[PDB]
Design a protein around this ligand. Sequence first.
Ligand SMILES: CCCCCCCCCCCCCCCCCC(=O)O[C@@H](COC(=O)CCCCCCCCCCCCCCC)COP(=O)(O)OCC[N+](C)(C)C
Ligand SMILES: CCCCCCCCCCCCCCCCCCCC(=O)O[C@H](COC(=O)CCCCCCCCCCCCCC)COP(=O)(O)OCCN
Ligand SMILES: CCCCCCCCCCCCCCCCCCCC(=O)O[C@H](COC(=O)CCCCCCCCCCCCCC)COP(=O)(O)OCCN
Ligand SMILES: CCCCCCCCCCCCCCCCCCCC(=O)O[C@H](COC(=O)CCCCCCCCCCCCCC)COP(=O)(O)OCCN
Lengths: 494, 75, 101, 70, 48, 125, 488
Amino acid sequence: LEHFCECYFNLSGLILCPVLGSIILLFIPNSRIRLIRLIGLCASLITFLYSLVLWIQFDSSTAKFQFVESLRWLPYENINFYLGIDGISLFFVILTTFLIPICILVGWSGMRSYGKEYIIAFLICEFLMIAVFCMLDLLLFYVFFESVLIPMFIIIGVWGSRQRKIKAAYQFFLYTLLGSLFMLLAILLILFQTGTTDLQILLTTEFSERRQIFLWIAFFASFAVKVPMVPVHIWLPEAHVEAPTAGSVILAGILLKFGTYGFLRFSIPMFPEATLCFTPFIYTLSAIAIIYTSLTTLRQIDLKKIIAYSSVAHMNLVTIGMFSLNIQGIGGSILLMLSHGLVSSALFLCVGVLYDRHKTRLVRYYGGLVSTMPNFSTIFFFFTLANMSLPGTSSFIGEFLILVGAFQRNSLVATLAALGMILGAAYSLWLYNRVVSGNLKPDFLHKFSDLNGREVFIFIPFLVGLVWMGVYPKVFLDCMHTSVSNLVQHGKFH
Amino acid sequence: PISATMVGALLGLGTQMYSNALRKLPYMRHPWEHVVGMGLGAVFANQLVKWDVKLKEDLDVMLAKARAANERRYF
Amino acid sequence: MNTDITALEKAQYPVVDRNPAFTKVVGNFSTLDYLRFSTITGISVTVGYLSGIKPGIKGPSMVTGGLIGLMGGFMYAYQNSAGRLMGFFPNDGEVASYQKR
Amino acid sequence: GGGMETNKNKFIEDWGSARENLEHNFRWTRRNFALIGIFGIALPIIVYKGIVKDFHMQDEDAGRPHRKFL
Amino acid sequence: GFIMEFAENLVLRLMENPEERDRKAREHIYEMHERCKKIKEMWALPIR
Amino acid sequence: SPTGLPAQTLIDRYVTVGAYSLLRSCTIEPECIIGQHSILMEGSLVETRSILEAGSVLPPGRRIPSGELWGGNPARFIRTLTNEETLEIPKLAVAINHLSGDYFSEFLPYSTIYLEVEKFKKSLG
Amino acid sequence: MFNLFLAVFPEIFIINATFILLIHGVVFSTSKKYDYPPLASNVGWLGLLSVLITLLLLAAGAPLLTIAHLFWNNLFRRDNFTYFCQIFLLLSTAGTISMCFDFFDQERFDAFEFIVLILLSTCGMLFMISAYDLIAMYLAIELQSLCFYVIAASKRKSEFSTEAGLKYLILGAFSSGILLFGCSMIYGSTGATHFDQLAKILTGYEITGARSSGIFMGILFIAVGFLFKITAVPFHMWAPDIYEGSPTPVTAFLSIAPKISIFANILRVFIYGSYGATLQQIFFFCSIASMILGALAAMAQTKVKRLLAYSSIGHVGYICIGFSCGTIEGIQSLLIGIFIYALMTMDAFAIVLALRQTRVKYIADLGALAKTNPILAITFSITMFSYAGIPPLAGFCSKFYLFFAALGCGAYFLALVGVVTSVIGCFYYIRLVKRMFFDTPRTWILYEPMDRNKSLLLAMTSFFITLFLLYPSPLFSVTHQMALSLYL
Ligand SMILES: CCCCCCCCCCCCCCCCCC(=O)O[C@@H](COC(=O)CCCCCCCCCCCCCCC)COP(=O)(O)OCC[N+](C)(C)C
Ligand SMILES: CCCCCCCCCCCCCCCCCCCC(=O)O[C@H](COC(=O)CCCCCCCCCCCCCC)COP(=O)(O)OCCN
Ligand SMILES: CCCCCCCCCCCCCCCCCCCC(=O)O[C@H](COC(=O)CCCCCCCCCCCCCC)COP(=O)(O)OCCN
Ligand SMILES: CCCCCCCCCCCCCCCCCCCC(=O)O[C@H](COC(=O)CCCCCCCCCCCCCC)COP(=O)(O)OCCN
């Protein structure tokens, strides 16, 4: 059945944009550095504007999928694949399209040595990740998620700073592939019942409570590695620290969101009974992760290691929210996913600004930077506040909505999750004051430069987005409520 | 639109360029070879499409015979 | 020696001659058969010449390639002509010539 | 004198690299057994039993049987 | 003329027809619930 | 060579040999810059990530230690290089290769001089 | 009478052309006048031509190959399955030959007899595919094997090549004797060697209590010979040593064509015959053993050739899982896995042969390849990721069917083993990518650019590997067709 959509701007062209950029860049000599830089930047910016348009034509009243279009693999038409979005996936497409040009801009100064391979890898990542977020089929979700492993592996291994990138890349690839294989096993078990992998159909089939338990575990084994949940979180610090700055931005801001997106998109609505049965288990794992990882964060001595550990606590709060299974919980989980994608990316950008000049991640070398880099200090303080969920910032909305959702289900889990307010403040303020406050240490660092124009411009949209979601989250929540409501209700008829 | 001829011509041109690159030669070292490659790729792609149609046609009859042989069991 | 030409898969075109004689098959060669024959032989001679230059035997290499091409091209033309007479290949010309003589 | 790069201190780098390679130091000692038994098994089990009881106490407050889990 | 009235009209022209979008959605399911039987018959074909 | 080591001239990777330079049976380790109008004599050795100033003279069997800037006639230690400077050396080599690409693209595989030779011959019978 | 031989036109042509090339080579290689020219490349080009003409004759005469089937019945059996098997075998032989010319001229391997032996082994494998009797099968297998023994020892002054040949001949002869013993037991128990007669006798009884121990052990011994041939564990250890010690073009040829021919044989013997669950269990246990041992041993390797050998052992384990589950989809998946593994192996050995011009030996010799030849490092990386089975590369098909067969048949231990071994394989495949892209060695090896033949072959196989799953319908249809034609 051809499900071709009426809209002019659709999903397939947004898929095709970075692909065309990559093919063009394949054939341009490395001597033409300016041309390569401009072509990559412009392709990414056009993709971002295309996604913004897709946001305008979005219809915030339906529980259905939108812009649905189809994609036909065999003339037999037994296997035909669909793309479409809703109010849970729209902003993730937008976030991906927004972050990719930021990645191209962060490496602007070093592009003469980076080459076209850097831009091509990031464009391919963009294409694959947008595809992943736009897929109405378990099997293609699988295929497009595993595909990102190759360019991410290359990005970490080639442009990482030091030789620990070897181990970091190995661990990233192997952990993620193990999880992916588990979810492939789940996909095949589903296919044996249903004869299909189309998401819309699986949302309308009934699974046995028993078959649901096994399928839920097999989904959990991928998703908990992706989130990450303890104790399969240890790949994340190594990988997110050893990666280049833009690589860390993509890893934390987008790739981490894929596990929570998988929970929201397949596990909760397809197996509601198993979702109910496992809820105490998820609550326990997430609460343990928040407390233990926050306390580990407190004792880290590397800038990137502190920012990377912080992401584990934030994502497990997201899981608590989404498994609360109400409007506050799921809405807050999605809002915190987007806000984290902005805030952690900005924090990695701040650390990258420091590392590009001074080539150290050890906190002890820095100090007193407020007197030589006041602009960087102010921006760093703002994003530090955002990482503490300060009211007025975007992260507070999601954090408090998730606590609201959890409290209505289980007051103990909400109480353990609200401890994050105390621990995250502690490590965020300690980091900021050890880096920026105090006196300079001229025996380690004596030469300084505040942000140039490119760095200031890079930070501006992050600031605008954080404040915008913090003060008026209605623009986002209005487009999401129908989808969130239908997700919450799926499986029940009262 | 996107015809087999165009896909095949693009693949043949890409093949010549990829071959040149692998040999550390300029992309357009022997351009008449690029023309030859576009022609061969177009021909190959069109023949693959026709072959695919013929293959489905033969598989249909063969599955029909398999089904008849299986249905003979319940007689 | 007992013989049986009967094939496993039956002919899908009218059978002009079930087991045509060798000379009948050769005399049945059409223009397309000769084109196939000549093309295969010419390509083979060309390959013989080009591959023979480096060893210095381009002439004898041409002869060897030409022998291979002659045998292969004749076998291919015979295959086509016999298959047409037997009804295994489209044989409009054979049927037309048969319905008249 | 020359450069924005930090002037490395050997002891600070030794401290950092020792932090990065802690897994080579793990010995299954008595203290480590106790710490993994208490914080890696017992406390998560206690938290899980707390969360479940919370739901069961809600269940009996609503005049409903205990919800089965896991 | 006015910016916003033009913008109103332009945005509505961009958007899916909600009626048609919700109707192909029904054809996919009705066709897929009753179409899910054909392929599983081939997987049960005896190899011998 | 006077040092007894083998006397081939080895210019390793990412090495920039400045214009008007004279090299005889010297070794240049990877990622070095030789200044313009320099002289490197028999058996001399330039260790990796080192820079010689323009007009330097390195006598037979002399060595330029790694990570250092040298210069003079004869060459003498000037200062130790920073890590940023040593990072710049392969960049200079790559940039010069990029420039050489433009010259490489001006020449087809064959010249047309043989035609001129042909007509010059024909005008002579 | 003459028209009866239309069923063997392809084979007649290739044999006659091989004789012509033998005479040409021996006459002019001994010529003082021509100063004893090397003829390996000249004969190689003429033999590539001969292979392509054979392919034309076979492909264009599809119905004619079945002519006079009653007259030829006690000698061979040609059908749809043998048709496509033989086409794929000829295509593989043509590619392998095309990859040999730089080796001929730069090493100066002047022996044209190498090409003749390859062509005669191709004749043997052609007859293997159409064999329909134990006697014919054994004879064709032996012809193929003797040709390999000779070419494995072609570097006759090399310690490695002579060692390879000696190990191959001894272990090959032993396994062939075991298989022949099995054939003798089956004949003695049934009075038959033709596959049709064996099918009629053995069907409907399998092990009905009063089982012919003669029939049961004949099957077992024949299976042991077959498993030796496909390098299945525990009959595998010849393969890594022979693969490493033989000349690299020999290693490339052995890695592909014999597998095609012997799986044709295995399908038509076992699948078409009847002892049953015992033999599928044989291939089950050997598949699991091959996957585990291939993964671990490949992880141990520091040299490229040995790594590829152990990789092929693991992949034949993956393929034999399809034979084990005994369904039309199992056979189809086995065929798809052979096709895709063959094209990936051709790609990998084209790269290896290109790098052998600078004597690549160790994985570490690939260091800085992403700098000295970026497009070559990317191409080799695509091959590795395809070997690892990362989607949407072509290699993902074998992993997908491995888990598809386990989940359905109820085999959870097989799925477990597949997950573990797939992760191990991915590690040792991406180790190569790390070596080419992430490492910064002090000494680099600069490689000479490859010839046109290998660049073109690499370019086409690299597009196939990246783009196959955009248009996989022809392979899917052709392999379903073949699986069905085994019984109808
Ligand atoms: C999304 C897939 C799943 C994930 C897998 C990803 C696998 C790749 C990993 C991604 C990370 C980054 C990869 C970087 C590669 C990009 C750089 C690159 O390959 O550039 C090549 C370009 O390589 C190629 O040649 C690619 C050719 C493939 C052709 C495919 C296109 C087919 C149709 C195009 C038609 C022709 C062009 C049309 C417009 C003119 C340049 O090669 P060099 O070795 O640097 O120099 C070549 C020599 N010379 C320039 C002088 C010619
Ligand atoms: C219609 C566009 C495409 C037509 C292509 C030609 C017609 C098709 C015939 C088959 C062509 C196949 C490709 C031929 C070249 C194959 C590779 C040969 C390269 C080689 O190594 O040998 C060279 C022989 O040159 C050669 O083999 C080439 C010899 C002369 C052919 C070039 C003329 C092509 C005409 C294109 C259009 C002309 C318009 C007017 C009709 C010697 O190389 P070298 O020493 O000579 O120099 C090379 C400077 N790197
Ligand atoms: C309700 C149970 C749920 C499942 C939990 C796991 C299974 C239960 C626990 C198994 C305990 C096995 C027996 C341990 C006690 C015997 C001690 C003997 C002496 C000893 O120290 O032996 C060590 C053996 O350690 C070992 O073999 C290590 C023991 C295994 C530890 C299991 C840890 C589980 C995961 C922890 C939590 C992770 C998630 C937290 C959020 C090696 O001594 P050595 O001499 O080599 O020492 C280095 C010296 N140079
Ligand atoms: C399916 C995925 C997508 C695929 C894309 C399909 C597109 C079609 C391909 C288009 C090709 C583009 C280039 C065409 C122009 C080049 C013409 C070749 C020139 C030529 O005569 O080459 C000779 C060598 O032969 C050669 O180099 C030819 C042999 C190359 C090997 C390939 C054929 C081998 C046999 C079949 C293999 C099948 C394997 C599969 C199992 C002489 O070259 P030179 O003059 O430079 O001198 C080399 C030094 N001796």
